[PDB]
Design a protein around this ligand. Sequence first.
Ligand SMILES: NC(=O)C1=CN([C@@H]2O[C@H](COP(=O)(O)OP(=O)(O)OC[C@H]3O[C@@H](n4cnc5c(N)ncnc54)[C@H](OP(=O)(O)O)[C@@H]3O)[C@@H](O)[C@H]2O)C=CC1
Ligand SMILES: [Mn+2]
Ligand SMILES: [Mn+2]
Lengths: 379, 379
Amino acid sequence: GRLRVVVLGSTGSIGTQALQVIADNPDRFEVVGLAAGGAHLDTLLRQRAQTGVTNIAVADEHAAQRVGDIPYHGSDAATRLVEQTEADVVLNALVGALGLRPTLAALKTGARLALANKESLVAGGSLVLRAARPGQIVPVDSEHSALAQCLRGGTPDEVAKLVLTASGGPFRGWSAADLEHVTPEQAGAHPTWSMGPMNTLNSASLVNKGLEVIETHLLFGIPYDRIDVVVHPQSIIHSMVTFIDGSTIAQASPPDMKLPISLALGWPRRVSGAAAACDFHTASSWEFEPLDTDVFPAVELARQAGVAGGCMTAVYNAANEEAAAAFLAGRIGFPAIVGIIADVLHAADQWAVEPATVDDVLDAQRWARERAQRAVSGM
Amino acid sequence: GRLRVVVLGSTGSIGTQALQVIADNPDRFEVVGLAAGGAHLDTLLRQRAQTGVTNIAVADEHAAQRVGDIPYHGSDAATRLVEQTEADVVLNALVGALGLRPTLAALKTGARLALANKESLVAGGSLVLRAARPGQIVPVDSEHSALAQCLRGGTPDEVAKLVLTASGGPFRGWSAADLEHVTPEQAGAHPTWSMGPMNTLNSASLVNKGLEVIETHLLFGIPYDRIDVVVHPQSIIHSMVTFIDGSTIAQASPPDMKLPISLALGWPRRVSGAAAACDFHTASSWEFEPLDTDVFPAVELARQAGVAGGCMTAVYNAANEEAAAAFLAGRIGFPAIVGIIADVLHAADQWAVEPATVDDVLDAQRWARERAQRAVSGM
Ligand SMILES: NC(=O)C1=CN([C@@H]2O[C@H](COP(=O)(O)OP(=O)(O)OC[C@H]3O[C@@H](n4cnc5c(N)ncnc54)[C@H](OP(=O)(O)O)[C@@H]3O)[C@@H](O)[C@H]2O)C=CC1
Ligand SMILES: [Mn+2]
Ligand SMILES: [Mn+2]
């Protein structure tokens, strides 16, 4: 009675940690599908051999050709893999708003969607939500996993606030002037989490936290004015829920994604030995500080976009993707990332309309990328 | 609807705070009984006048002589009140040995027992556990209330460890050499108005934490070797549960006993506005450090007593009461408190037998008191 898992983005950080959790728990889990982009064929072939799964999607046609006998190849490969593979859980660890169609396909199959790809939910918004039954989307994200656990501390009507923690990034405490000179190398560091290149930059810019505020509203149905963000440099407390009696329930663990991965895969059942627990035989401190919203307005912009609703959250994410690419390429400065997002959101009148189809979401993103490029061109 | 509440020990700290919670929540609670010792008879009489509750009990027959219209007076007045009063919740906030019989009576009525009286569990042990049905006892103290909330984080089978937080008391971080100089005043002997000198002393000696560890075992059925203590000077995290996957769930609030009191009264339902929540607008830190068990062995000793079982925890507590009072009277030094507890316990193996009656518990306490007296005097 074990769970069949499709792993999308298997060669990345989350995909590989997920495979390790599955390998350590053959009793509970079985890999039945793998999807990757094709940039790391060494890893993918290793995964094919180690798991014995030949049911693979490779996005890059040239890379799929070089491997040979890949059953699904091309831009729709991951989507068709999901549509055609019998599974109990789809782990979406793809990166960027491109995880949207596989997310929608997964929900349509009725399987659990263990969601690491927050962008697909942020972009899909109510379109993704309509495709899901209650509890079908289970968060892999450390914060959202923590929130889901802490919500067990009371009934829904007893929730006052959801409190997301943020690491603060490498630039915690820096001034606006300090941020002007930030290099791609400087933004490529993270004090607590080891992640891919986009999540690391997003954590530095605080856009990751903005995306997580939106994800929180969408997953848990809590109003934006009841979703708080506190800076916690240690990343040990992964988030908390405050109840109407004044009690706060918090989730805590040394930073290790295998914990929320393991919990997402086998929800509601915890997976014995998934990760190390906090060690209370040695001294430590858990520090909290307010976010400097003047220097880091990305979270406030996310709330604005979220409150607007419809396709506005897709716009927020798409504008970030474009500005982020420009920064990494050395075309714009670091403060310009969130500056461009604000510029694009301000122009995004038409996009408050609720998406009826995936094409509405794609239209919004297409516009947002263009408007983002316009803003880059002007600086 | 409205829960009918009997308040035993209505004139003490817990009792009066509970009456405030009840006054503030007339939708949720109604007082249907009040019981007190008699030393604060005037307060009880004012309480009858304020609540309109005439169903009252006074233990002290002398005190009762002052009134003429008390329905329940004399020894076991509180017990008789419990036996003869229809109620949904009995709050047992009586102090010491006079709490045990009312606890037993409350359990037999089938009411929920909101338990503050430590002696009921620490001394009464298996007598109380054999009488109680699952979930019948709801703990009132902050650590136990924290644990009950955090246990919501998983199934019973998913619990790895219970971690109680401890303030560390006034001598946190003190060497054994430092402790030799401790005076009653330093250990918290002030004529404070609401509470006896023992509470502050028991905190300082770490015996209170030991008592809490024993009660934790009895309340939640977790072995002593899986009940840990961490020193946390802020007392914001009130305790935590570590699950088999590595996740820790923690309960946090600014110190305020109205929170755990309100939740014990309303269990399982939280009481809106009971206490203030953690506020993250100003920076703070939550510090943890190990307890030096060489310098503070009171908790290790409690586990030893608890593992031994039967009436051994009764012995532990009674030896403390005697030794702690001897320290306050200047008959011994501070380090000798836990020293005498150890010496009495090590001589106490005849008391490992399970008590059949309340008198068996009383015999054990009698022996332990006499034993500690000889240890103090040198006889
Ligand atoms: N990493 C973390 O610790 C955390 C991650 N997340 C979220 O999870 C998601 C992934 O995180 P992360 O593992 O770090 O990302 P990574 O960059 O480390 O891995 C990205 C994965 O997606 C694959 N991929 C890229 N492009 C395509 C494409 N066009 N088609 C199909 N597959 C593609 C890559 O395969 P390949 O490169 O071989 O072509 C790779 O396996 C993100 O949305 C992130 O926000 C959330 C919380 C923390
Ligand atoms: Mn996250
Ligand atoms: Mn306590």
